[PDB]
Write a protein that binds this ligand. Structure first.
Ligand code: NAP
Length: 325
C-alpha cells in the first residue's frame, strides 16, 4: 500500500502525514552551517515530503531556505510538503503561543506549518533563554496549564497559521487532560515520542490509536548517542543481533529494518541524517516488508529503557516519564 511515491497516512482532522520524514536536529557546535539546508534539499530530491524541525534546533531558517528553493524550482508545490514545528517550554503562556508560531513562520518565510506541536508538557520560565535557571543552577519552572496552552494552539489553527495540531512527550494523563477538555475544538492528531525496537511504546500506541492519534517516532534509529543527554545504558540499537540478521535476509541495513518496522505498524518515522548516503538509505523502505513473525520478534526486542530520559527535569510537575505511559 505504501510506496516511495505515495506514503501519506490519514490524520483525524482530514489532513494526511507522510509516514517517513527527515529529522533535523543536530548539535549546533559540531554541525557545519548549511548542512541542514543541503540535507533537506537532498531529502526532497530523494523523495521525502515530510520534514521535522523546531525553532530551538537553531536551523529553522535553513529548513525554510531548502523548502522554498525546492518550491521555487518546481520540484514540489507547498501543498506537497509537510513541515512540523514545535512550541518549546518557555513559550507555553497562552499569550505567547501565537507570537511564537508567527516567529517560526517568519523564520521559515512560509504562510503556515503543516503540524505545530507542544514540544514538551513541561512549562519553563518565560524569557529569552530556552533553559531558565538561577545562579544556583536550579531550573526555573513555570506552572503548566496545558488546557489553556492548547486553546491558544487552537486559535492558531482557526487563524489558518497551521493545518494540524499535536503534542510531543505527552503521557496518557496529559493526553486525557486535553482529550476531555470542556469545549475541545481541535483534538491533537499526533503525539511525537521516542519509539524504536528498544522502546516500542506498546501501551501508549494502543491508547493513541484508540483516540485516532497517530504516533510519530522520534529518535527512530536510537539517537546519535550523545552522552550529554543520551542514556547510553543500552547498547547501540543499530548493532543489535536480530536487527542485523534480518537485514541480511532482505539485503537491508539494521536502520532500514527498524524504520520499516515502525511504518509497517502505522507509526510515522522521522530519522535524522545530514549524510548524503544515509539520507537515501533511510528512504529505501518501501520495496520490502517484514513478516508477521519478524514483526513480532522485532517488537519482542523492547527493553522499556529510554535513550531520552531528560532526567534533569524529572522534578518538574509535568515530567512525563514517571507514569508507566
Ligand atoms: N520532540 C522531541 O522531544 C524530539 C526529541 C529528539 C528528536 N526529535 C526529532 O526526531 C528526529 C530524529 O531523532 P534523533 O535525531 O534524535 O535521532 P535518530 O534519527 O534516531 O538518529 C540519528 C543519528 O543516527 C545517524 N544515522 C542516520 N541514519 C543512519 C543510518 N542509516 N545508519 C547509521 N546511522 C544513521 C545520524 O548521523 P548522520 O546525520 O551523520 O547520518 C545521527 O547520529 C530529530 O532530528 C528531530 O527532528 C524530537
Amino acid at each position: 500500500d505504501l510506496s516511495a511515491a505515495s506514503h501519506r497516512i490519514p490524520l483525524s482532522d482530514g489532513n494526511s502525514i507522510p509516514i517517513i520524514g527527515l529529522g533535523t536536529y543536530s548539535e549546533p557546535k559540531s554541525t557545519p552551517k548549511g548542512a541542514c539546508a543541503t540535507s533537506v534539499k537532498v531529502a526532497i530530491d530523494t523523495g521525502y515530503r515530510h520534514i521535522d524541525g523546531a525553532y530551538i534546533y537553531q536551523n529553522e531558517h535553513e529548513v525554510g531556505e531548502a523548502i522554498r528553493e525546492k518550491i521555487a524550482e518546481g520540484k514540489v508545490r507547498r501543498e506537497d510538503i509537510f513541515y512540523c514545528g514545535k512550541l518549546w517550554a518557555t513559550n507555553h503562556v497562552p499569550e505567547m503561543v501565537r507570537p511564537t508560531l508567527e516567529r517560526t513562520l517568519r523564520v521559515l518565510q512560509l504562510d503556515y506549518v503543516d503540524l505545530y506541536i507542544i514540544e514538551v508538557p513541561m512549562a519553563f520560565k518565560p524569557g529569552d533563554e530556552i533553559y531558565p535557571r538561577d545562579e544556583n543552577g536550579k531550573w526555573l519552572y513555570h506552572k503548566s496549564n496545558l488546557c489553556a496552552t492548547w486553546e491558544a494552539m487552537e486559535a492558531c489553527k482557526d487563524a489558518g497559521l497551521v493545518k494540524s495540531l499535536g503534542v510531543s512527550n505527552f503521557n496518557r494523563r496529559q493526553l486525557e487532560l486535553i482529550l476531555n477538555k470542556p469545549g475541545l475544538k481541535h483534538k491533537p492528531v499526533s503525539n511525537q515520542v521516542e519509539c524504536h525496537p528498544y522502546f516500542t511504546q506498546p501501551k501508549l500506541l494502543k491508547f493513541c490509536q484508540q483516540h485516532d492519534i497517530v504516533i510519530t517516532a522520534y529518535s527512530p534509529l536510537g539517537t546519535s548517542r550523545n552522552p550529554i543527554w543520551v542514556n547510553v545504558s543500552s547498547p547501540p540499537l543499530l548493532k543489535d543481533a536480530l536487527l542485523n540478521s534480518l537485514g541480511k535476509r532482505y539485503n537491508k541495513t539494521a536502520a532500514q529494518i527498524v524504520l520499516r518496522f515502525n511504518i509497517q505498524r502505522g507509526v510515522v518515522v522521522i530519522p535524522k541524517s545530514f549524510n548524503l548516503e544515509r539520507i537515501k538509505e533511510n528512504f529505501q523502505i518501501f520495496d520490502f516488508s517484514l513478516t508477521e513473525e519478524e514483526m513480532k520478534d522485532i517488537e519482542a526486542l523492547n527493553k522499556n529503557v529510554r535513550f531520552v530520559e531528560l532526567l534533569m527535569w524529572r522534578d518538574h510537575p509535568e515530567y512525563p516519564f514517571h507514569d508507566e505511559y
